[PDB]
């Protein structure tokens, strides 16, 4: 050892809690020095005063389960993400995969920062007035980089490699399972920065917040036949979320959304978070 210079802690570990914690009995107390009612919120720690340190309590054994508050049961519900119509007029549509088009699922997923999950997609398809007509349809998923079909009878519809479903209108709705497919370790709904290098100007200002680890290609449907079908079609896509793991919670949004790609809000009507009242003394 010629150089004496070169030779040279987690805080809390998790545990299972099936039920809510019980309440133990207590009595009155008269003493000096010990005080649980006085805290200091300046340190950023929340208070640890229970019920028994302020009043006298009895003994209550509660068996209230905390199962419904887990993240698995909170997210595993199918929600609407897309409405796709074929009046587009040539019997096919190419829809870019973006799951931020409807505000009810966007608010729940933006509660966390990083998320890692597997999905399950379901397609419910009918006419624009709910009417049913026997008709053959084809769905095709196109990964990013793959060629896309430009016509109703292109060579991309041969599906030699692409996953695809053939389903009729009179059938039960189709269901598929999709694994976690990002190049990174988790999806993120917020990306503070620019994706590319080089100079950032007013022509390239729309790049701010677009992370390529979330762009998953496109999605294409068509009527199967080579001619023009005489019916209008409308597709609704529902997505469930399975095997959820989340990280780094955030405040929830209280302003209404404006676009799918940026958190811009309306600058004139800033909505106050609570409903206002008249006086501070009268409820």
């Amino acid at each position: 050892d010629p150089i004496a210079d070169m030779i040279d802690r987690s805080l809390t570990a998790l545990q299972v809690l099936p039920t809510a914690a019980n309440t133990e009995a207590s009595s009155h107390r008269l003493g000096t020095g010990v005080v649980p009612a006085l805290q200091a919120a300046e340190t950023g720690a929340s208070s640890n005063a229970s019920d028994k340190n302020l009043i006298e309590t009895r003994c209550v054994l509660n068996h209230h389960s905390t199962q419904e508050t887990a993240i698995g049961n909170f997210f595993s519900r199918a929600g609407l993400v897309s409405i796709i119509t074929m009046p587009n007029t040539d019997g096919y549509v190419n829809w870019d995969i973006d799951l931020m088009g409807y505000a009810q699922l966007r608010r729940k997923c933006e509660l966390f920062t990083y998320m890692r999950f597997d999905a399950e997609f379901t397609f419910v398809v009918a006419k624009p007035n709910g009417v049913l007509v026997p008709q053959l349809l084809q769905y095709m998923y196109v990964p990013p980089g793959a060629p896309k079909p430009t016509s109703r009878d292109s060579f991309a519809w041969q599906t030699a490699t692409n996953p695809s479903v053939f389903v009729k209108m009179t059938d039960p709705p189709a269901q598929v399972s999709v694994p976690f497919m990002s190049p990174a370790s988790a999806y993120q709904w917020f990306y503070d920065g620019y994706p590319t290098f080089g100079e950032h100007l007013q022509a390239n200002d729309l790049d701010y917040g677009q992370c390529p680890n979330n762009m998953m290609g496109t999605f294409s449907i068509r009527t199967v036949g080579t001619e023009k079908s005489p019916h209008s079609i409308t597709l609704r896509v529902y997505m469930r979320i399975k095997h959820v793991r989340a990280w780094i919670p955030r405040p929830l949004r209280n302003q209404p959304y404006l676009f799918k790609t940026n958190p811009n809000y309306k600058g004139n009507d800033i909505k106050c978070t609570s409903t206002s009242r008249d006086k501070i003394t009268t409820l």
Partner: protein, 242 residues
């Protein structure tokens, strides 16, 4: 093959149903996970973190909404005035809508357990005073004077070095769970009225200002729980996004 029959419940699409579906990518492998700090296993870990309560939600504070987080306390000439009052319903609209607890209770229907409300004084160093914070179980309205309000659960606060006190709101109810209170028939699930009174005056020497402010923080205790998930009504979608 084997004889079967199809029962009722066939070919329905149940959104909260859990089943096995066919995969689209055989032999696929995901990216291996790395250790990222701050993993949330349960939604009750967020409900114990205190956030700011919006007590001063007046009609004149809608164009300057930075003042709704602090409510003032000044020098009085009389004794026993009240400074603020609000309901203790975490699910009803009002001051509790600004909390991370009040926004997470909207995604459920029934809740149980006890709360806590932490107040923090933010005046000068030379100023002093004593406040009385009382919680009254339902049956009566807001008390007209201090000598009525001191009958419920109450805590006397003293300003000094420790500038924070926690009034715990204990769980006193007839049912095991409580739905979201509202005007009509669902006010049967109301939980009480929280007021705050001047125990003594707010005494200040010469050279220090005569008006201070108090911020209020709210959180849940360890025996808190929820059930019966539903959707919130705070968000909407009238116009189409993008």
């Amino acid at each position: 093959g084997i004889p079967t029959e199809l029962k009722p419940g066939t070919n329905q699409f149940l959104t909260t149903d859990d089943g096995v579906s066919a995969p689209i990518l055989p032999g696929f492998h995901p990216t291996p996970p790395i250790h990222i700090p701050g993993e949330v296993h349960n939604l009750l870990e967020i409900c114990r973190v205190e956030t700011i309560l919006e007590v001063n939600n007046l009609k004149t504070n809608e164009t300057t909404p930075m003042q709704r987080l602090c409510f003032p306390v000044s020098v009085q000439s009389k004794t026993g005035e009240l400074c603020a009052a609000f309901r203790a319903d975490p699910g009803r609209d009002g001051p509790w809508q600004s909390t991370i607890l009040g926004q997470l209770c909207r995604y459920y229907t029934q809740w149980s357990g006890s709360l806590e409300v932490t107040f923090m004084f933010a005046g000068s160093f030379m100023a002093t005073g004593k406040m009385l914070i009382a919680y009254t179980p339902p049956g009566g309205n807001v008390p007209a004077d201090r000598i009525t309000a001191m009958l419920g659960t109450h805590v006397i606060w003293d300003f000094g070095l420790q500038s924070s006190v926690t009034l715990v709101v204990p769980w006193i109810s007839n049912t095991h769970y409580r739905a979201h209170a509202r005007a009509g028939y669902f006010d049967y699930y109301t939980t009480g009225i929280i007021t705050i009174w001047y125990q003594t005056n707010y005494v200040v020497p010469i050279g220090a200002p005569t008006t201070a402010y108090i911020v209020a923080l709210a959180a849940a205790q360890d025996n808190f729980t929820m059930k019966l998930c539903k959707d919130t009504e705070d968000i909407e979608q009238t116009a189409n996004i993008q």
